[PDB]
């Protein structure tokens, strides 16, 4: 089952965190990351097209994120606003989609 | 600008309803319809890839829906459970996706 977890779980303000992703389905179009516990386009961080390996910012993009080809998400110079939940949506080639939510806590 | 509306807005139990879709963006991979007001994989009705013109059922699929190449969704022999909100997610080529929510009322 698709899952995501934060390394580290508790993050000091101004440092770094990596959202690891495990168990990606086969045959994907792309990835979309969202701030919060649900898919919500108004809160999209980034969209990643696998076919072209291209990332594109959403409205929630801070400029401090970096998504990787396996959907992992790096955030640098973490701020208070970065704290809390993140939701990854994986878009499969049949447009039937899966989500996983994770969190980390800034201090 | 992406919107959806029901025809008819008030629907007799056992009849038919067409969810019309307006202002699709350019450059999309496909469509994802969900029951309710938000994107939620657990409530996904159908996924549709415009390149292959293939429909695939999600967990919320009743077997009474038909999706069209312009994302329009036909529901036949409408039940009480069908009532309420539907949400369309349009998957864009850059994976920064768009949503539109509509509804109809069964009586
Ligand atoms: C400094 C952070 C940049 C490094 C690139 C992040 C890529 C990490 O990605 C990780 O590769 C691991 C090895 O299999 C897997 O366990 C993980 O599922 C995956 O999340
Ligand atoms: C009962 C069978 C009806 C099939 C409906 C086919 C889809 C119709 O769809 C509609 O076609 C119109 C012209 O493009 C547009 O006004 C609409 O945006 C569109 O939703």
UniProtKB/Swiss-Prot annotation, chains A, B:
Pyrrolidone carboxylic acid found at: 1
Induction: Induced in primary T cells by activation with IL-2.
Tissues expressing this chain: Expressed in columnar epithelial cells of the colon (at protein level). The predominant forms expressed by T cells are those containing a long cytoplasmic domain. Expressed in granulocytes and lymphocytes. Leukocytes only express isoforms 6 and isoform 1.
Residues covered by the Ig-like V-type domain: 1-107
Glycosylation sites: 70, 77, 81
Record region (Required for homophilic binding): 5-107
Subcellular location: Cell projection, Microvillus membrane; Apical cell membrane
Family to which this protein belongs: Belongs to the immunoglobulin superfamily. CEA family.
Domain notes: Ig-like V-type domain mediates trans-homophilic cell adhesion through homodimerization and this active process is regulated by tyrosine kinase, PTPN11 and PTPN6. Ig-like C2-type and/or cytoplasmic domains mediate cis-dimer/oligomer.
Quaternary structure annotation from Swiss-Prot or TrEMBL: Monomer. Oligomer. Heterodimer. Homodimer. Cis-dimer/oligomer (via Ig-like C2-type and/or via cytoplasmic domains); induced by trans-homophilic cell adhesion through an allosteric mechanism transmitted by the Ig-like V-type domain, and is regulated by intracellular calcium and calmodulin. Interacts (via cytoplasmic domain) with calmodulin in a calcium dependent manner; reduces homophilic cell adhesion through dissociation of dimer.
Protein name: Cell adhesion molecule CEACAM1
Gene: CEACAM1
Covered range of the whole protein: 35 to 141 of 526
């Amino acid at each position: 089952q698709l899952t995501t977890e934060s390394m580290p779980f508790n993050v000091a303000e101004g440092k770094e965190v990596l959202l690891l992703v495990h168990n990606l389905p086969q045959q994907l179009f792309g990835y979309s990351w969202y701030k919060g516990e649900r898919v919500d386009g108004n809160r999209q961080i980034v969209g990643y097209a696998i076919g072209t390996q291209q990332a594109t910012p959403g409205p929630a993009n801070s400029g401090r994120e970096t998504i990787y080809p396996n959907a992992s998400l790096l955030i640098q110079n973490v701020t208070q606003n970065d704290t809390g939940f993140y939701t990854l949506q994986v878009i499969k080639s049949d447009l039937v989609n899966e989500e996983a939510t994770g969190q980390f806590h800034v201090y």
